[PDB]
Design a protein around this ligand. Structure first.
Ligand SMILES: COc1ccc2nccc(NC(=O)c3cc([N+](=O)[O-])ccc3Cl)c2c1
Ligand SMILES: CCCCCCCCC(=O)O
Length: 260
């Protein structure tokens, strides 16, 4: 029945709120400087990174920015893992499959959600107290300058669909439960859940965005851009592991990469 899927759409939206402090809705309130529900300090040059630590809670600059972005990713994983637990069925799967689903799944969700924190011109840093311009990032030293850039590229395409937090909650739940993923001992239970989630996503898209012709199809197509961006990410990473074999990396970010 439609009613059953509607109930699942709501259950996941509830957990999404509970698990992600910076909603897309909060983000686009901060970004659209109209509603000064607290406006961000912005960082656009080296000499403004200073008052970023002056006014905001947060070893060469380009490295220290990169480490700070890497730290927001472990926090992003922690939250994503918290959200998965709530997807009905998930905790019931084989444990080894729970991990692989997360191993491949988190990154794709990192950048889906990061799109909420972006406009064409920059990205919210530091829970929303900051805003760092895409140009300052692009201007960084050359093993880091073009690191974040293809994220802005994806975000601008993706932001165009203009999704809700209530749509994203079902969409990120789909991404997690792929079955497409290498090493899954047990695929059909994963696939059975995802087909029910794609039902929830489909329906929700039609109710929440009716005049938006074939958004469901257009959304699922954006998973093409997602995969491709995670891949040039890991190759960008392994390069920094040899340009600065003195720079560390969080262990929980280590496990996301058994490459090849
Ligand atoms: C640029 O500052 C921000 C602002 C908002 C963010 N939101 C989510 C996730 C973020 N982190 C990354 O993308 C990332 C990942 C790795 N990594 O996986 O080694 C390394 C460096 C950075 C983020 C970063
Ligand atoms: C540290 C709070 C996490 C939110 C975005 C992280 C960006 C922080 C930074 O790059 O300095």
């Amino acid at each position: 029945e439609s009613a059953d899927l509607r109930a699942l759409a709501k259950h996941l939206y509830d957990s999404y709120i509970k698990s992600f402090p910076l909603t897309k809705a909060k983000a686009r309130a901060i970004l659209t400087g109209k509603t000064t529900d607290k406006s961000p300090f912005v960082i656009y040059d080296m000499n403004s990174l200073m008052m970023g630590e002056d006014k905001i809670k947060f070893k060469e600059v380009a490295i220290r920015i990169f480490q700070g972005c890497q730290f927001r990713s472990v926090e992003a994983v922690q939250e994503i893992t918290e959200y998965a637990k709530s997807i009905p069925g998930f905790v019931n799967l084989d444990l080894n499959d729970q991990v692989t689903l997360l191993k491949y799944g988190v990154h794709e969700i990192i950048y889906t959600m990061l799109a909420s924190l972006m406009n064409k011109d920059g990205v919210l840093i530091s829970e929303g107290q900051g805003f760092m311009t895409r140009e300052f990032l692009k201007s960084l030293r050359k093993p880091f300058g073009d690191f974040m850039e293809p994220k802005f590229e994806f975000a601008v395409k993706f932001n165009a669909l203009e999704l809700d937090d209530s749509d994203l909650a079902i969409f990120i739940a789909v991404i997690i439960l792929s079955g497409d993923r290498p090493g899954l001992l047990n695929v059909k239970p994963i696939e059975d859940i995802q087909d029910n989630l794609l039902q929830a996503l489909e329906l929700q898209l039609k109710l929440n965005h009716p005049e938006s012709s074939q958004l469901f199809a257009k959304l699922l197509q954006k998973m093409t851009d997602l995969r491709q961006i995670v891949t040039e990410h890991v190759q960008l990473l392994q390069v920094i592991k040899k340009t600065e074999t003195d720079m560390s990396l969080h262990p929980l970010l280590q496990e996301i990469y058994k490459d090849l």
